[PDB]
RNA sequence: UUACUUAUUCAAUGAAGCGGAGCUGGAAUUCAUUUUCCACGUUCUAGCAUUCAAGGUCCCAUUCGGGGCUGAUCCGGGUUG
RNA sequence: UUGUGACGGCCCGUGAAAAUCCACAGGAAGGAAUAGUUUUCAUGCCAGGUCGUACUGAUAACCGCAGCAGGUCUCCAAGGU
RNA sequence: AUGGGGAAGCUCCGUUUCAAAGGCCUGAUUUUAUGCAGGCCACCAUCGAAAGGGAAUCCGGUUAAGAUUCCGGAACCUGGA
């Protein structure tokens, strides 16, 4: 129960991974992959826009 | 010169100074005496057969108590009045409308001896 | 140098959280502030009849400063010197039996609205200054007409608070000189010449001239744009 | 006589709407700066059923532009909107289902829903399931978009009035017969206390203009004047014609 | 019939970006002096955007580091319709 | 019989809110060595007030003029047929 | 209730409304304090359930009549140091 959570230690309420006690392993992995992939895509799109402006 | 920078578009009531009361005369001019002293919270014992049983076997003094007295006040009053350490206080408002307190003393004290010191065997 | 990096935040429409801009233009002001500002705005927008805005024609800074310098020379007596004067005259009447003329004749500025109005009526007023800050304008709205009829030099000056500071108060709303000392009668005359040229002899023009009627800057821009695209043929 | 049912319905004692299970007022995003100069991207988190409402609602989360916050707006879900979809709201938004472009920015013949009657009212028109608004034309001078309403009426709205592209989900709901006083009961149990409906002819003359008689009959013409008063306005109010008409949409 | 806005009236927001003016390069009929508009960085993805902001100029006693300017244009204080 | 679990059916009906508690993102701030931090690990110390609490709950403790064949919400629920 | 607006008025509406609407973290912290050039924010009063939501107790014994309340034993929670 919510107040019962106050008497237990921190280990019982979380997992050692990032976003441990908040998000599941698969969702954390999906958002890591998403972050890395679309920041790389942001770099690619920025480079392509700069080079097309140079061409223009 | 320039106007004050207002990064919030809201206006709040400024924190003006709040002085402390400095009366020119006392409100009531005489502090009332203690409205609940030991002699008021501890009115009298209860000397029914059941209460005497609690005294003789349970090491428990049974008192009629001021209806406005709580367990802290009863404990303090019993300690101040009979020079005894108490272990627990239980209270109940009786069907006749008065407060009744079962005060259990520590094992270092004898309720029977304290009762026959008070005057009721 | 190799440890620091160029962040720059992009403040586009959907890019980054906006930084703390000065939003004083958009403050949700209290109602009293809002009523102050809108009272000003409405007085400006409404066509004011000549009797208003024959005020708001105050003197310029330098002539107002020299007028108030002369009047500070003619400042009234404060509580301390007044009480000292009372003690001195009491001692005088006690010892020399002088008929209450031991103390000299005061030379002071005359203040008080109805006192000064009576002074203009009896033509004792050598010069009169009228504030433009009077909360009900009708208290003094007639005063330039009275000064014109009586032929007494009048001016409209900025600050009932300034006049009050002159006559040793918070707010005088009018001041008047009736007597001048010989040492600065010339200064008063040279002041009155310009005061008169600015106010007394322009009385008919200022009584004919209608004031007010200005719009706000957005409305001015609107009529500017409309006029430009109209006369563009 | 007596105060009749339609008169009693305005005091709102037992006739107020049952709003416990509702999911909040479905309103467009506040027209702040981005909605009228560029666009803003929100994300559709969940599409939910709203009690008393045939259309699904969509909860869309936007980023606060002026502070580090998330703002959850409650939208009327358009057909084809799904969870995880990106919604774009603003003048610069693209013509896609679920976007909140202004009428001036959408072209003629566009299907829009949750359209604002005035710019900033956060959605007034075409909000029931399956309903939409057609963009008929533009008047760029004193910008006014002409639209066609779900009833067939032609309206002239400001060109800055927002609206979601597409049609409203839950369409075709009234094609199913209820089949049951039970289904009607459960429908209205969370709309409001307007069902069942007793006929006025089945009442007494104290209770209704139609009540009374030794047969159940209205007695006088059931078409009531627009200038009639409360207690008189029971029947066909300001009817231009009556009877079964063979006709079309005529719009 | 129609114009003004300031009375009155309607609506929204935590009154946040209104009106106008412009660092900037051009798509681009300029008679040698730009009317417009865009450059004033967001659209394949259920990620993340916050610590007077990093950087960049100017300065310091330089001790938990900072202080102006700029980043983040200026003017009008008509919150906006 | 009760509780629980994984499921399946129904709806133009999809079947409260808030207090409260925890967690995560972030990284402000602070921290060495005969001693710092950890009171989300274990142990140890103190206190926990006020009011109700008996009994009936019905063919006699309630309402119906009553110790009235009436009315008045609910939990437990053995064997055989 | 308040702000505000009606009503001759008893009072009516209204509950975030055209309001200048507060409490909450750590330093100041005994030349003077709980001031303040420390900092964070910006809820709409309140009442409303002894069947809704909720911090924590069980067994045995004990009375003429109370007990998950007393006693014996064995625990748990909250708030403090």
From Swiss-Prot, chain A:
Superkingdom of source: Eukaryota
Ranges that cross the membrane: none
Subcellular locations according to the entry: Cytoplasm
Description of how the protein assembles with itself and partners: Component of the large ribosomal subunit (LSU). Mature yeast ribosomes consist of a small (40S) and a large (60S) subunit. The 40S small subunit contains 1 molecule of ribosomal RNA (18S rRNA) and 33 different proteins (encoded by 57 genes). The large 60S subunit contains 3 rRNA molecules (25S, 5.8S and 5S rRNA) and 46 different proteins (encoded by 81 genes).
Family of this protein: Belongs to the eukaryotic ribosomal protein eL34 family.
Cited function: Component of the ribosome, a large ribonucleoprotein complex responsible for the synthesis of proteins in the cell. The small ribosomal subunit (SSU) binds messenger RNAs (mRNAs) and translates the encoded message by selecting cognate aminoacyl-transfer RNA (tRNA) molecules. The large subunit (LSU) contains the ribosomal catalytic site termed the peptidyl transferase center (PTC), which catalyzes the formation of peptide bonds, thereby polymerizing the amino acids delivered by tRNAs into a polypeptide chain.
Miscellaneous comment: Present with 23600 molecules/cell in log phase SD medium. There are 2 genes for eL34 in yeast.
Protein name (Swiss-Prot/TrEMBL): Large ribosomal subunit protein eL34A
Lineage, opening ranks: Eukaryota, Fungi, Dikarya, Ascomycota, Saccharomycotina
Residues represented out of the complete protein: 58 to 113 of 121
Curated annotation (Swiss-Prot), chain B:
Keyword field: Cytoplasm, Isopeptide bond, Ribonucleoprotein, Ribosomal protein, RNA-binding, rRNA-binding, Ubl conjugation
Family, as annotated: Belongs to the universal ribosomal protein uL23 family.
Organism per entry: Saccharomyces cerevisiae (strain ATCC 204508 / S288c)
Record carries keyword Electron transport: no
Cross-link (Glycyl lysine isopeptide (Lys-Gly) (interchain with G-Cter in SUMO)): 40
InterPro entries documented for this protein: Nucleotide-bd_a/b_plait_sf, Ribosomal_uL23-like, Ribosomal_uL23/eL15/eS24_sf, Ribosomal_uL23_CS, Ribosomal_uL23_N
Oligomeric and partner information: Component of the large ribosomal subunit (LSU). Mature yeast ribosomes consist of a small (40S) and a large (60S) subunit. The 40S small subunit contains 1 molecule of ribosomal RNA (18S rRNA) and 33 different proteins (encoded by 57 genes). The large 60S subunit contains 3 rRNA molecules (25S, 5.8S and 5S rRNA) and 46 different proteins (encoded by 81 genes). uL23 is associated with the polypeptide exit tunnel.
Protein name, per record: Large ribosomal subunit protein uL23
Main location: cytoplasm
CC terms in the record's Gene Ontology section: cytosol; cytosolic large ribosomal subunit; preribosome, large subunit precursor
UniProt GO MF annotations: RNA binding; rRNA binding; structural constituent of ribosome
UniProt GO BP: cytoplasmic translation; ribosomal large subunit assembly
Gene3D superfamilies hit by this protein: 3.30.70.330
UniProt subcellular location: Cytoplasm
UniProtKB/Swiss-Prot annotation, chain C:
Compartments (UniProt record): Cytoplasm
Residues spanning the membrane: none
One GO molecular-function entry: RNA binding
Keyword Hydrolase: no
Sorted UniProt keywords: Cytoplasm, Ribonucleoprotein, Ribosomal protein
Family per similarity comment: Belongs to the eukaryotic ribosomal protein eL8 family.
More info: Present with 238000 molecules/cell in log phase SD medium. There are 2 genes for eL8 in yeast.
Protein task: Component of the ribosome, a large ribonucleoprotein complex responsible for the synthesis of proteins in the cell. The small ribosomal subunit (SSU) binds messenger RNAs (mRNAs) and translates the encoded message by selecting cognate aminoacyl-transfer RNA (tRNA) molecules. The large subunit (LSU) contains the ribosomal catalytic site termed the peptidyl transferase center (PTC), which catalyzes the formation of peptide bonds, thereby polymerizing the amino acids delivered by tRNAs into a polypeptide chain.
Protein name in the entry: Large ribosomal subunit protein eL8A
UniProtKB/Swiss-Prot annotation, chain D:
Listed Gene3D superfamilies: 2.30.30.30, Nucleic acid-binding proteins, Ribosomal protein L2, domain 3
InterPro entries in the record: NA-bd_OB-fold, Rib_uL2_dom2, Ribosomal_uL2, Ribosomal_uL2_C, Ribosomal_uL2_CS, Ribosomal_uL2_dom3, Ribosomal_uL2_RNA-bd_dom, Translation_prot_SH3-like_sf
Origin: domain of life: Eukaryota
GO BP term, pick one: cytoplasmic translation
A single GO cellular-component term on record: cytosolic large ribosomal subunit
SMART domains (UniProt xref): Ribosomal_L2 (SM01383), Ribosomal_L2_C (SM01382)
Protein name: Large ribosomal subunit protein uL2A
Cross-link (Glycyl lysine isopeptide (Lys-Gly) (interchain with G-Cter in ubiquitin)): 45, 92, 118, 144
Coiled coil: none
């Amino acid at each position: 129960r919510p107040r019962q959570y106050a008497t237990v230690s921190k280990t019982h309420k979380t997992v050692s991974r990032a976003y441990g006690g908040s998000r599941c392993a698969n969702c954390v992995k999906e958002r890591i992959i998403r972050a890395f992939l679309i920041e790389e895509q942001k770099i690619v799109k920025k480079v392509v826009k700069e080079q097309t402006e140079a061409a223009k | 010169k320039a106007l004050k920078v207002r990064t919030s578009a809201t206006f709040r009531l400024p924190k003006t100074l709040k002085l402390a009361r400095a009366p020119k005369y006392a409100s009531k001019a005489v502090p009332h005496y203690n409205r609940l002293d030991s002699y008021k919270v501890i009115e009298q014992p209860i000397t029914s057969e059941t209460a005497m049983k609690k005294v003789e076997d349970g090491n428990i003094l049974v008192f009629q108590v001021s209806m406005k007295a709580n367990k802290y006040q009863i404990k303090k009053a019993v300690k101040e009045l009979y020079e005894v350490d108490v272990l627990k206080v239980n209270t109940l408002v009786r069907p006749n409308g008065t407060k009744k307190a079962y005060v259990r003393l520590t094992a270092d004290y004898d309720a029977l001896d304290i009762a026959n010191r008070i005057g009721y065997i | 140098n190799p440890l620091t990096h160029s962040t720059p935040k992009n403040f586009g429409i959907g890019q980054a959280v906006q930084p703390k801009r000065n939003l004083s233009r958009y403050v949700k002001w209290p109602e009293y502030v809002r009523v102050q500002r809108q009272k000003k705005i409405l007085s400006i927008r409404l066509k004011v009849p000549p009797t208003i805005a024959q005020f708001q024609y105050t003197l310029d800074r330098n002539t107002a400063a020299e007028t108030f310098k002369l009047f500070n020379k003619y400042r009234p007596e404060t509580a301390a010197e007044k009480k000292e004067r009372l003690t001195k005259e009491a001692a005088a009447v006690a010892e020399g039996k002088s008929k209450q003329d031991a103390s000299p004749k005061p030379y002071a500025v005359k203040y008080g609205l109805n006192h000064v109005v009576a002074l203009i009526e009896n033509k004792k007023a050598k010069l009169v200054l009228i504030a433009n800050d009077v909360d009900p304008i009708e208290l003094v709205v007639f005063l330039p007409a009275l000064c014109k009829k009586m032929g007494v030099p009048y001016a409209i000056v900025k600050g009932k608070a300034r006049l009050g500071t002159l006559v040793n108060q918070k707010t005088s709303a009018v001041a008047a000189l009736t007597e001048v000392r010989a040492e600065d009668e010339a200064a008063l005359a040279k002041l009155v010449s310009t005061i008169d040229a600015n106010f007394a002899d322009k009385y008919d023009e200022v009584k004919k001239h209608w004031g007010g009627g200005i719009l706000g800057n957005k409305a001015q821009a609107k009529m500017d744009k409309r006029a430009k695209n109209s006369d563009s043929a | 006589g007596r105060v009749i049912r339609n008169q009693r319905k305005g005091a709102g004692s037992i006739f107020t709407s049952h709003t416990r299970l509702r999911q909040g007022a479905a309103k467009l995003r506040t027209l702040d700066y981005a909605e009228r100069h560029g666009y803003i991207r929100g994300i559709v988190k969940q599409i939910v059923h709203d009690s008393g409402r045939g259309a699904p609602l969509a909860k869309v989360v936007f980023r606060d532009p002026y502070k580090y916050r998330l703002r959850e707006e409650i939208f009327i879900a358009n057909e084809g909107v799904h969870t995880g979809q990106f919604i774009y709201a603003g003048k610069k938004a693209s013509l896609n289902v679920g976007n909140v472009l202004p009428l001036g920015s959408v072209p003629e013949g566009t299907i829009v829903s949750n359209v604002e009657e005035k710019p900033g009212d956060r959605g007034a028109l075409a909000r029931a399931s399956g309903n939409y608004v057609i963009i008929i034309g533009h008047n760029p001078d004193e910008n006014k978009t002409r639209v066609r309403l779900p009833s067939g009426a032609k309206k002239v709205i400001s060109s800055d009035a927002r609206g979601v592209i597409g049609v409203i989900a839950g369409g075709g709901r009234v094609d199913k017969p209820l089949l049951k006083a039970g289904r009607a009961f459960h429908k209205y149990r969370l709309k409001r206390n307007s069902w069942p409906k007793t006929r006025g002819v089945a009442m007494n003359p104290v209770d209704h203009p139609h009540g009374g008689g030794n047969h159940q009959h209205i007695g006088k013409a059931s078409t009531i004047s627009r200038g009639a008063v409360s207690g008189q306005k029971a029947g066909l109010i300001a009817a231009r014609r009556t009877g079964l008409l063979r006709g079309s949409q005529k719009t």
